[PDB]
Design an enzyme around this catalytic site. Structure first.
Site, PDB file in Angstrom:
ATOM      1  N   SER G   6      27.708 -18.726  20.456  1.00  0.00           N
ATOM      2  CA  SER G   6      27.989 -18.424  19.056  1.00  0.00           C
ATOM      3  C   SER G   6      28.352 -19.752  18.412  1.00  0.00           C
ATOM      4  CB  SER G   6      29.118 -17.424  18.910  1.00  0.00           C
ATOM      5  OG  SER G   6      29.724 -17.528  17.643  1.00  0.00           O
ATOM      6  N   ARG G   7      27.388 -20.383  17.765  1.00  0.00           N
ATOM      7  CA  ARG G   7      27.657 -21.736  17.317  1.00  0.00           C
ATOM      8  C   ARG G   7      28.166 -21.797  15.894  1.00  0.00           C
ATOM      9  NH1 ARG G   7      28.962 -22.982  22.095  1.00  0.00           N
ATOM     10  NH2 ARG G   7      27.409 -24.162  23.298  1.00  0.00           N
TER      11      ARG G   7
END
Lengths: 104, 177, 105, 277, 104, 140, 140
Positions: G6-7
């Site tokens: 989850s950037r």
């Protein structure tokens, strides 16, 4: 299937060197540091050629595999290889003498 | 004169300095023996532990009361608290007794030790029961062994061992009880 | 299978019972609806099946439920086409299944 | 490209039955050669309760033996012995002592030369082909007695069970070249015994240490053979595990290719028919 | 696969069939040698997956004889053709029926 | 044999053949599980080697010779002579000759009983069992 | 954990959880490394045994039950008590009860300070190291 125990010594040498040059091709990016946390490195082309030649000829078989992982150039492999080795001892003496007792 | 007092314990201590530290200490033949020579005891009266061994067998390990060993001076016997001995055995009959019953193993020779703690370790190569030898082939072979007498002292020493083993086998097979 | 469903739904909705329905080889139901979809000139979907495979299966399986009157519990024999559980007919059937009882030799 | 995967499944499945055969073969050989290993375990005991255990003694000349396997699917047994060879061969080094290294088994011939090549003198091999006999270990002891050191080291794997083979160094000293010199304390411990030899004590120990070398060499290469068979049984256990997980991955990917083949041929047929009607 | 070994004509011996392979058509002395040659070439193929891995170290002194006899059979099915003198080097051979029956 | 089934199964088998095929298919299932390890002959196992040797016997039993179909009593006498052990002596490559050495040497009055009764009764089992030891098989 | 990512939400999460969880991601990374090396247990480095025991403690920490979500300060304290010491007494089984004992026996003011401040201040780190020592772990 048969593991690395069935290989030739020539084959064990090329597997070790190839694992080192697989990890050495990886690189931290400056745009990836906001989610990886590791600051990125710009590796110059002359440093790339010299470092990969050294890992090819067998100049850096003394170093482990993970010293090559996510470093810039071959100076940082030797820096990380000193640091991984140096830590192999330093794991304690956070027992007392704190800044986190009740009246600090 | 004994300025290198080695052992499993000293090799454990010095081996943690020159080998890499993750390697466990290599085992030693001392670690699988509960019985020693200087460890006093294991006597208990009349019967003593007789470790009659063989390269390809273990013929006896229970305690017996008297053992007739065929040493090179002649047949001798071992009772319980015998004197320490390192006896080379000529080819002869090792008699194991537990009472009235006697089992007669004719051996090929090889040493037999008696230790200070009364344990006796008969250590011979080919240790046959005297049941499984035939009385025919021994003189049949000694007739040829009394013929090929060369000047080759290797072959002549083999002939000497041959005629002496065969003669002892003959003299042990005519003299059954 | 819809005829067996209707016989079971009468016992559920009028008699108020806990009915058992046994759809013997739900895969043959799938294969039959695939044949009637192929014969009506519809383009087949993935591997070879009817384009309406999920809804032609769900139209049968959603009538097997618990109402406020009673219930229908369905014991459906499942054939797996090429010993391949990712084939779309068992992968669509296994979305509807609440239990498997594997009988072993 | 859909038939490369089917023949790769063929290769992985035949490899996975070959290794399952060799696992059962090693397990069969491990039980009917354990009936000869713990028989010969007894005779090592009188020599250790007579002569003791002196590994780190300052020998002038030393012959170290690493007895290893001949066939090669043993799975890191011979390499563990090759590393304990140098691990116990550097713990001897205190004054610049001479060392001869000797390997029993073909897979030690190739592996000690990488680490100690100038100190290599002999390769005994083809030893487990028929079986291991005491006359054979006697001849190997004879050729280790042709040059006559002050100490002997035998490195092997002690067959504890089918799981553990913790390796063993057994040490054999030349008769009074160092052995009685390691025994004399406030007198001696060897002088308790009445030597009942024909000739003097210096010759009964001369015969007795050759018999100790033969017994230790026989038991070493018997224990090493049984630990080799159990190590191969544990090595082909992981090979069928690997050739089953690789087979399962390849079967899943073949199922994907089968489904995609039927879909793409069907889309070709539908597009051909729709361009006419 | 037969052609990459150099066996020419590269006729697959197992896969080539005929309706003339009945013993009541070509006799029993022809039929049983053809079926025996096929059986030896088949269990050689069943051994060949283990020769390529292990290497003839266990093969029981009869399956070793199976491998040797089948390699002799596999070479003996090859034949220089009178039209392939241009290709490799060899004058071509006509082999009569009784000669190849006696040979195999 | 592993892939050939019959969903009707043994309810429509010849009785008498059902007496012997039920253990024949179990022996062949055990042989198929231990199969392809027969290339390990020098590497012997002494419990699976028996079922491997007997499976190699029985696969040589069921071979036939092209438009010579066999009557069913001769078939179940052959499966009796191979299943119960009367051909454990004979070498594996001449069982096809040891089969008609059983069919032609066992006297054909047995075949009439086994066809007409349609099962192996112990009254016929004892006689057939005696008749299966006096066969002159090609063995040594 | 090696594949989940989850950037965009990273560096936009809870600050105390961001202070604690980088060590958790790194320790699960090394746990994945040494489980990628040794899928069978026979060769123990005793520092590889340490990262195995810490990884097995942490993957018992992160697993939870259904239909009961936790507030973020009670997750921050629960992974603070695991990425540090405070749970190595508990072996591998009783961690599910250990974290419940930690949530129960910690004085619930520190949850209010951690929620209100956003991160663990050094005063709160001091009180949190203090409060995680008077906790009665079920593995004893």
């Amino acid at each position: 299937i048969l593991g690395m125990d069935e290989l030739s010594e020539e084959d064990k040498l090329t597997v070790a060197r190839a694992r080192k040059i697989q990890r050495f091709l990886s690189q931290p990016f400056q745009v990836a540091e906001v989610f990886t946390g590791t600051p990125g490195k710009y590796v110059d082309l002359a440093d790339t050629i010299s470092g990969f030649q050294g890992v090819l000829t067998g100049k850096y078989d003394d170093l482990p595999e993970m010293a090559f992982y996510m470093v810039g150039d071959i100076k940082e492999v030797k820096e990380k290889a000193d640091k991984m080795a140096k830590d192999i001892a330093s794991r304690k003496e956070a027992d007392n003498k704190k800044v986190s007792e009740e009246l600090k | 004169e004994a300025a290198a007092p080695a052992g499993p314990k000293e090799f454990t201590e010095v081996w943690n300095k020159k080998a890499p530290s993750t390697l466990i200490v290599p085992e030693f033949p001392s670690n699988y023996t509960a019985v020693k020579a200087v460890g006093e005891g294991q006597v208990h009266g009349d019967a003593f532990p007789v470790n009659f061994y063989t390269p390809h067998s273990i013929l006896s390990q229970a305690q017996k009361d008297t053992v007739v060993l065929p040493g090179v001076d002649g047949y001798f016997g071992v009772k319980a608290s015998h004197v320490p001995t390192i006896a080379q055995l000529k080819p002869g009959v090792v008699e194991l007794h537990s009472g009235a019953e006697s089992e007669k193993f004719f051996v090929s020779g090889g040493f037999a030790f008696v230790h200070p703690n009364g344990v006796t370790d008969i250590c011979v190569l080919e240790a046959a029961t005297l049941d499984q030898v035939d009385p025919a082939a021994v003189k049949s072979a000694l007739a040829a062994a009394s013929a090929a007498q060369p000047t080759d002292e290797f072959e002549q020493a083999a002939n000497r061992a041959a005629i002496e083993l065969y003669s002892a086998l003959e003299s042990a097979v005519e003299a059954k009880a | 299978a819809l005829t067996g469903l209707t016989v079971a739904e009468y016992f559920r909705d009028i008699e108020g019972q806990d009915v058992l329905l046994f759809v013997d080889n739900i895969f043959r139901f799938t294969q039959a609806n695939s044949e009637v979809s192929a014969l009506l000139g519809r383009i087949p979907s993935a591997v070879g099946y009817q384009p309406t495979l999920a809804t032609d299966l769900g139209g049968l399986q959603e009538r097997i439920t618990t109402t406020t009157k009673g219930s229908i519990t369905s014991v459906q024999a499942v054939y797996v086409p090429a010993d391949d559980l990712t084939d779309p007919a068992p992968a669509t059937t296994f979305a509807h299944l609440d239990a498997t009882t594997v009988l072993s030799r | 490209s859909n038939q490369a995967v089917k023949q790769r499944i063929r290769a992985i499945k035949n490899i996975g039955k070959i290794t399952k055969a060799m696992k059962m073969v090693a397990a069969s050989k491990m039980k009917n050669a354990q009936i000869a290993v713990e028989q010969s375990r007894g005779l090592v005991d009188p020599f250790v309760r007579l002569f003791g255990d002196f590994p780190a003694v300052n020998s002038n000349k030393s012959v170290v033996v690493a007895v290893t396997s001949d066939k090669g699917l043993c799975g890191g047994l011979n390499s563990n012995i090759t590393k304990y060879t140098r691990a116990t061969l550097a713990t001897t080094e205190s004054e610049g002592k001479d060392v001869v290294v000797v390997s029993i088994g073909d897979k030690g011939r190739s592996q000690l030369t990488r680490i100690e090549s100038q100190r290599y003198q002999l390769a005994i091999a083809d030893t487990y082909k028929v079986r291991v006999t005491f006359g054979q270990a006697s001849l190997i002891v004879e050729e280790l007695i042709k040059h006559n050191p002050q100490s002997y080291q035998i490195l092997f794997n002690k067959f504890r069970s089918a799981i553990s083979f913790k390796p063993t160094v057994a040490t054999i000293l030349s008769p009074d070249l160092l052995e009685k010199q390691l025994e004399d304390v406030t007198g001696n411990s060897l002088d308790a015994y009445d030597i009942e030899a024909s000739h003097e004590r210096s010759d009964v120990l001369r015969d007795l240490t050759e018999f100790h070398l033969g017994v230790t060499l026989y038991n070493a290469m018997l224990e090493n053979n049984c630990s080799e068979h159990a190590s191969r049984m544990s090595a082909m256990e992981n090979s069928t595990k690997s050739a089953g997980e690789m087979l399962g991955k390849l079967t899943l990917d073949y199922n994907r290719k089968r489904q995609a083949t039927i879909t793409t041929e069907l889309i070709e047929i539908i597009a051909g028919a729709s361009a006419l009607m | 696969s037969i052609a990459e070994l150099g066996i020419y004509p590269a006729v697959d011996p197992l896969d080539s069939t005929s309706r003339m392979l009945n013993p009541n058509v070509i006799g029993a002395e022809h039929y049983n040698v053809a079926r025996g040659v096929q059986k030896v070439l088949q269990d050689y193929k069943n051994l060949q997956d283990i020769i390529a891995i292990l290497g003839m170290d266990e093969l029981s002194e009869e399956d070793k004889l199976t491998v040797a006899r089948a390699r002799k059979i596999q070479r003996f099915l090859s034949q220089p053709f009178q039209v392939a003198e241009v290709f490799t080097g060899t004058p071509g051979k006509y082999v009569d029926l009784a000669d190849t029956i006696s040979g195999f | 044999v592993g892939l050939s089934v019959s969903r009707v199964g043994s309810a429509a088998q010849f009785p008498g053949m059902k007496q012997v095929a039920g253990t024949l298919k179990l022996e062949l299932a055990q042989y198929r599980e231990v199969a392809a390890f027969a290339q390990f002959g020098s590497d012997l196992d002494a419990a699976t080697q028996y079922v491997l040797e007997r499976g190699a016997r029985l696969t040589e039993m069921l071979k036939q010779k092209q438009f010579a179909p066999i009557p069913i009593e001769r078939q179940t006498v052959a499966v009796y002579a191979a299943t119960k052990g009367f051909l454990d002596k004979v070498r594996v490559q001449d069982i096809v000759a040891a089969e008609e050495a059983v069919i032609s040497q066992v006297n054909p009055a047995v075949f009439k009983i086994l066809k007409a009764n349609g099962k192996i009764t112990p009254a016929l089992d004892a006689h057939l069992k005696a008749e299966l030891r006096k066969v002159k098989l090609p063995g040594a």
